[PDB]
Design a protein around this ligand. Structure first.
Ligand code: FES
Length: 96
């Protein structure tokens, strides 16, 4: 219902709180932050995150995007937080 997620972005460690029915960037943006994205669809790599800590955000959404959620690589434009969490957020320079 409202997991405290921390994003370790360029500039600092900001901590948002996102409801479980809200994509992590939907929130992130409303707060007034960036993460780079394209498609808004999980169609690509641009808004790629890395889970530091936490569960795993239900990413049963954004997929055709190379089967490595597992690496901790999560796609922020189509992510549902499942609990409390920390995530690195500028992350295509891993994926390639
Ligand atoms: S912006 Fe394309 S997958 Fe997230």
């Amino acid at each position: 219902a409202s997991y405290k997620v921390t994003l370790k972005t360029p500039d600092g460690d900001n901590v948002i709180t996102v409801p479980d029915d809200e994509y992590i960037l939907d929130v992130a943006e409303e707060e007034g932050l960036d993460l780079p994205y394209s498609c808004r669809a999980g169609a690509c790599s641009t808004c790629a995150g890395k889970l530091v800590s936490g569960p795993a955000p239900d990413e049963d959404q954004s997929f055709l995007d190379d089967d490595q959620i597992q690496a901790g690589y999560i796609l922020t434009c189509v992510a549902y937080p499942t609990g409390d969490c920390v995530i690195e957020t500028h992350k295509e320079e891993a994926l390639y």
